[PDB]
Amino acid sequence: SPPLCTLPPGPEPPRFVCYCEGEGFNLYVTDAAELWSTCFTPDSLAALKARFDITPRFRAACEQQAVALTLQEDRASLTLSGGPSALAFDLSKVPGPEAAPRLRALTLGLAKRVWSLERRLAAACPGESLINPGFKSKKPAGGVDFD
Amino acid sequence: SPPLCTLPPGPEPPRFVCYCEGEESGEGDRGGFNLYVTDAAELWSTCFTPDSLAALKARFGLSAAEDITPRFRAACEQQAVALTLQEDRASLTLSGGPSALAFDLSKVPGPEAAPRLRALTLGLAKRVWSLERRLAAAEETCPGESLINPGFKSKKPAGGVDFD
């Protein structure tokens, strides 16, 4: 299962989603309108690991909600807390045409995971005078009774 | 928990998603019932109107006051949702109940489909996040060189022979 988390962690509606794919491995942070990615490459991925698998660390941070985000124009940074040393990742805005297919597939994968988890979670004419048409049939004289 | 389901059934990768909104309980804001089918690329919705919604209810013998959302629960869990896709219009068939309904869907405009797809994406990620914690708690809880001649090993006197 691909780990992910939603920010802010409070009861307010979510504004950003952080997730990882395919450990080309990259860390994706998006607000469903723009996508920020680390743009990792096989040469750069090894270099960052030497300076400091990343998915178990990212998965642990998502479960603990220890992910800090700072967004400023096209520059984004993701901070993971929980390990012996804090991990800081630099993210750049994905171009619109490039980011569209990734947000395209993101909605499909999340929606199936919602249904799949729920599927597994659940397994755990009257009154008319005939003589005179169109008129009431009068009641005859009745007088008064004694009771 | 709002309903939703995905096709094709089985371990196949996701291709299309069916979900609906409206029928919200309480005295708050209430919107008309609508079925939404999408592949996260183009959004298809029934675009139900008050006159059109009653017509489909009368087509299948459903009252005006009856809620269609609870019956969509039957189709989603039982995986009785059949979707036929064409160039412009889409048809959804629900067989979760004793009778089958056919829903006609139309293409949602881009300026409106995108915000709904972007709002759904944030909601699903939050919902996946919410389910796992509830599931987790409920399920379980140099030396050797001759100084006489550089570049040559240090020489030791001949050791002769010893006895053991």
What secondary structure does DSSP assign to chain B, as a single string? Answer: ---EEEES-SSSPP-EEEEEE----SSS-----EEEEE-SSSEEE----HHHHHHHHHHTT--SS--SHHHHHHHHHHT-EEEEE-SSEEEEEE-SSSS-EEEEEEEPPHHHHHHHHHHHHHHHHHHHHHHHHHHHHHHT--TT--SSSTTSPPP---------
Q: Quick check: A32 and B119 CB within 8 A?
A: yes
Distance CA B73, CA A90 (A): 43
First to last CA, chain B: 88
Distance CA A47, CA B84 (A): 49
Query: Is A108 in Cβ contact with B120 (below 8 Å)?
Result: no
Q: How far apart are CA A116 and CA A6, in angstroms?
A: 19
| List of residues 6+ apart from A31 with CB closer than 8 A | A15, A16, A17, B122
CB contact under 8 A, B117 and A111: no
| Cα–Cα distance measured from residue B75 to residue B82, given in angstroms and rounded to the nearest whole number | 9
Say how far apart CA B82 and CA B104 lie, in whole Å. Answer: 12
Distances (CA, A) of A45 to A38, A138, B13: 10, 102, 28
User: What distance in Å separates the CA atoms of residue B37 and residue B4, rounded to the nearest whole number?
Assistant: 10
Q: Which residue of B has its CA nearest to A7?
A: B126
Report helix, strand or coil for A122: helix
Q: Testing the interface with A: which of B129, B135, B140 to mutate, by most A Cβ within 10 A?
A: B129
Closest CA to A107 of A55, A56, A35: A35
Q: How far apart are CA B116 and CA B111, in angstroms?
A: 9
CA dihedral A117, A118, A119, A121 (to 10 degrees): 80
The CA-based angle A4-B134-B10, given to 5 degrees, is: 70
3-state SS of A85-113 is CCEEEEEEECCHHHHHHHHHHHHHHHHHH
Report chain B's C-alpha Rg in angstroms: 35
Structure tokens at A43: 């040469």
Residue B69 CA: distances (Å) to CA of A12, A117, A123, B34, B89: 26, 20, 22, 9, 22
* SS3 labels along A6-70: EECCCCCCCCEEEEEECCCCEEEEECCCCEEECCCCHHHHHHHHHHCCHHHHHHHHHHHCCEEEE
**Alpha-carbon distance values, A34 to A94, A107, B140 (Å):** 7, 14, 38
- For chain B, the residue count is 164
Instruction: Say whether the peptide bond before residue B70 is cis (omega within 30 degrees of 0).
Output: no
Distances (CA, A) of B21 to A47, B53, B99: 47, 14, 22
Q: How many inter-chain contacts (A to B, CB under 8 Å) are there?
A: 87
In this complex, do B131 and A121 lie within 8 Å of one another by their Cβ atoms?
yes
The span from the CA of B14 to the CA of A108, in Å, is: 6
Reading the block at residue A131, the tokens are: 């003589």
Q: Tell me the Ramachandran region of residue B14: left when phi exceeds 0, alpha when psi lies from -120 to 50, beta otherwise.
A: beta
Count other C-beta atoms under 10 Å from residue A26's C-beta. Answer: 19
CA distance B16 to B24: 24
Resolution (A): 4.6
Measure the CA–CA gap between A54 and A23, rounded to whole angstroms: 8
Locate B44 and state its tokens. 């298809």
Which distant-in-sequence residues (6+ apart) come within 8 Å of A66 by Cβ? A80, A81, A82
Dihedrals phi, psi of B60, to nearest 5 degrees? -105, 15
Per the CB < 8 Å rule, is A117 touching B129?
no
Residues of B in contact with A112 (CB under 8 A): 6, 14, 17
For chain A, first and last CA: distance in Å? 87
B140-149 long-range Cβ contacts below 8 angstroms, 24+ apart: none
Residues of A in contact with B41 (CB under 8 A): 104
